[PDB]
Amino acid sequence: TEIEILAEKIARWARARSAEIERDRRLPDELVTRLREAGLLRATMPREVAAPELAPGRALRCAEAVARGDASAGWCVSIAITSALLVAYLPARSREEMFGGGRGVAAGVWAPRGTARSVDGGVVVSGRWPFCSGINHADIMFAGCFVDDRQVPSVVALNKDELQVLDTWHTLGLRGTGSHDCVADDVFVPADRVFSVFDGPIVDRPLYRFPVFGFFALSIGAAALGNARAAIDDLVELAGGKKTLAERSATQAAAATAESALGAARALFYEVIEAAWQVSHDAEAVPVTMRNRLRLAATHAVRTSADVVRSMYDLAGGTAIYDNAPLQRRFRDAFTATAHFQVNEASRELPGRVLLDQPADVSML
Q: What's 183-230 look like in SS3?
A: EEEEEEEEHHHEECHHHCCCCCCHHHHCCHHHHHHHHHHHHHHHHHHH
| Helix (H), strand (E) at residue 164 | strand 164-166
Q: Which residues pair with 180 in a beta bridge?
A: 132
- Give bridge partners of residue 9 from the DSSP assignment: none
Phi/psi for 360 (5° steps) reads -150, 145
Measured CA to CA, the distance from residue 218 to residue 317 in angstroms comes to 31
Calpha distance 133→180 (Å, rounded): 7
CA nearest neighbour of 6 among 27, 33, 28, 46: 33
Experimental method: X-ray
Residue pair 52/3 in contact (Cβ under 8 Å)? The answer is: yes
Q: What is the experimental resolution, given in Å to one decimal place?
A: 2.1
Cβ atoms 365, 288 nearer than 8 A:
yes
Per the DSSP assignment, residues forming a β-bridge with 222 are: none
Cβ-contact 75, 67 below 8 angstroms: yes
C-alpha–C-alpha distance, residues 237 and 235, integer Å: 5
Element containing residue 181 per DSSP (H, E): strand 180-190
Residues in the chain after which the chain is broken, C→N over 2.5 Å: 243
Specify binding-site residues.
Answer: 108, 110, 113, 133
The separation between CA 96 and the C-alpha centre of its own chain, rounded to angstroms, equals: 25
Integer CA distances (angstroms), 247 to 41, 231, 291, 325, 360, in order:
43, 19, 44, 21, 51
The count of other CB atoms within 10 Å of the CB of residue 165 is 16
> What does the H/E/C string look like for 91-152?
CHHHHHHHHHHHCCCEEEEEEEEEEEEEECCEEEEEEEEEEECCCCCCCEEEEEEEECCCCC
Amino acid at 306: A
Strand, helix or coil for residue 322: coil
Q: Which residues are annotated binding-site positions for FMN?
A: 108, 110, 113, 133
Could you give the CA distance from residue 278 to residue 186 in angstroms, rounded to a whole number? 43
Task: Count how many Cα atoms sit within 13 Å of the Cα of residue 3 in the half-sphere of its side chain.
Answer: 25
